[PDB]
Amino acid sequence: AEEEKRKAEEEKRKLVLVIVCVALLLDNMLYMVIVPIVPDYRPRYPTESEDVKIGVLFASKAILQLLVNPLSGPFIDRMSYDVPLLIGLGVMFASTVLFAFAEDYATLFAARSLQGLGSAFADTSGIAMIADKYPEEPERSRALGVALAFISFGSLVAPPFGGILYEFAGKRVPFLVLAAVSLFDALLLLAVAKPPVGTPIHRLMLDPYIAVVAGALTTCNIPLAFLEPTIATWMKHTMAASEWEMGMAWLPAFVPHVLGVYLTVRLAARYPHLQWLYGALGLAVIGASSCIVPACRSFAPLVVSLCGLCFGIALVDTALLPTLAFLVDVRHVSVYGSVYAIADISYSVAYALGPIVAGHIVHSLGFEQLSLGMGLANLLYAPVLLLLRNVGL
Ligand SMILES: O=C(c1ccc(Br)nc1)N1CC2(CCN(C/C=C/c3ccc(Cl)cc3)CC2)c2cc(F)ccc21
């Protein structure tokens, strides 16, 4: 009667993990489908008409979650994770039907800002629930790996099919049925789940290990903040490939991501205290790919540079997300809202700055200077990550 209840608890953990991963897949599906659609009002290149009045609408999501997350930390610390996860999925459903319902400028602005309001609860609550229900060390990294695999699926293989299903039927019908799948997911989490003073955000940042992880997340995420709104209009200047071979450059860069997650999980189960060197080895190929992209004149080298660039983010963001939970475990009290709020500030400070200044600094100086500067930053972020020789003690 003890093993029976234990198997029931294992089933109750797995049926919540799968539902959280499907919700994250659908969320990144939304974030990657709606990007070519906004400047309109067979595949589609991401960005067009990059100016000051539309890039601020593309960065409205990131600037609103950057403004919300320092207050949305303690709401997850005091309360549970089920309640902010349901609030995030509810306002994400409202935003998803709002994209289908309207076609103005300010209404699309409100629909893009409600996605930031939805992310700033749902994403941090999902990663906090995954880090809560797996207290032991290898299962934490394994659940992190499965979550990153579903997020990389829903953010990499989703645009070249979302565009070609957007061209045929129109806007309204696919976003209505996808919002129906989102409400079905939220109702199924309701039917399954049935719903410590903590430490403030004012002193988490002064902890230097939290600070170096927070710097590493921004520095590893910002090349995909500056290369996504730029490379599509740059392909037509050097080689000028066809439109199928311009928006599908990030599609073969998914299998090296999941193989990189598989590699660092399987060889972090062996060595427990080498995650800092996995992070440095991830930043190595991040900097190498961000240096080697403009040299790739043909299309297949420019695909293999992007698959190296997607390999590196897999290594870094699988090596440093369980490290952050272990760090807030063995150095502070065991709460998981504020430190992943710090992580989301570190993600969003790149995405709130990329699509505003990227096209203007390409038009002012050039694309190769941007690439060499970011590769210079990722290669010079080596002595800063030598501070993590003490987390195994
Ligand atoms: O395309 C985007 C994107 C999405 C939204 C917006 Br707005 N802009 C861009 N991304 C983001 C990113 C997504 C995955 N990582 C962050 C995940 C943190 C996280 C959150 C919850 C959980 Cl449970 C576990 C982990 C790193 C970055 C990524 C990796 C790739 F290999 C390729 C592309 C992308």
Curated annotation (Swiss-Prot):
It comes from the Eukaryota. Belongs to the major facilitator superfamily. Vesicular transporter family. GO terms for biological process: acetylcholine uptake; chemical synaptic transmission; neurotransmitter transport; positive regulation of acetylcholine secretion, neurotransmission; positive regulation of long-term synaptic potentiation; positive regulation of neuromuscular junction development; serotonin uptake. The chain holds residues 34 to 474 of 532 of the full protein. Keywords: Congenital myasthenic syndrome, Cytoplasmic vesicle, Disease variant, Glycoprotein, Membrane, Neurotransmitter transport, Synapse, Transmembrane, Transmembrane helix, Transport. It catalyses: acetylcholine(out) + 2 H(+)(in) = acetylcholine(in) + 2 H(+)(out); choline(in) + 2 H(+)(out) = choline(out) + 2 H(+)(in); serotonin(in) + 2 H(+)(out) = serotonin(out) + 2 H(+)(in). Residues 104-112, 165-172, 230-244, 297-307, 363-366 are lumenal, vesicle. Changing E228 to A/K: Loss of activity. GO terms for molecular function: acetylcholine transmembrane transporter activity; acetylcholine:proton antiporter activity; monoamine:proton antiporter activity. This is Vesicular acetylcholine transporter. Its main location: membrane. One of its GO terms (cellular component) is AP-1 adaptor complex. Potently inhibited by L-vesamicol, reserpine and tetrabenazine. Changing E228Q: Has normal transporter activity. Loss of activity. It is found in: Cytoplasmic vesicle, Secretory vesicle, Synaptic vesicle membrane. The chain crosses the membrane at residues 15-35, 56-76, 83-103, 113-133, 144-164, 173-193, 209-229, 245-265, 276-296, 308-328, 342-362, 367-387. The record marks D123, D317 as: Important for transporter activity. Electrogenic antiporter that exchanges one cholinergic neurotransmitter, acetylcholine or choline, with two intravesicular protons across the membrane of synaptic vesicles. Uses the electrochemical proton gradient established by the V-type proton-pump ATPase to store neurotransmitters inside the vesicles prior to their release via exocytosis. Determines cholinergic vesicular quantal size at presynaptic nerve terminals in developing neuro-muscular junctions with an impact on motor neuron differentiation and innervation pattern. Residues 77-82, 134-143, 266-275, 329-341 are cytoplasmic. It is a multi-pass membrane protein. Peripheral and central cholinergic nervous systems. The keyword Transmembrane helix applies. It is linked to Myasthenic syndrome, congenital, 21, presynaptic: A form of congenital myasthenic syndrome, a group of disorders characterized by failure of neuromuscular transmission, including pre-synaptic, synaptic, and post-synaptic disorders that are not of autoimmune origin. Clinical features are easy fatigability and muscle weakness. CMS21 is an autosomal recessive, pre-synaptic form characterized by ptosis, ophthalmoplegia, fatigable weakness, apneic crises, and deterioration of symptoms in cold water. Learning difficulties and left ventricular dysfunction may be present in some patients. The keyword Membrane applies.
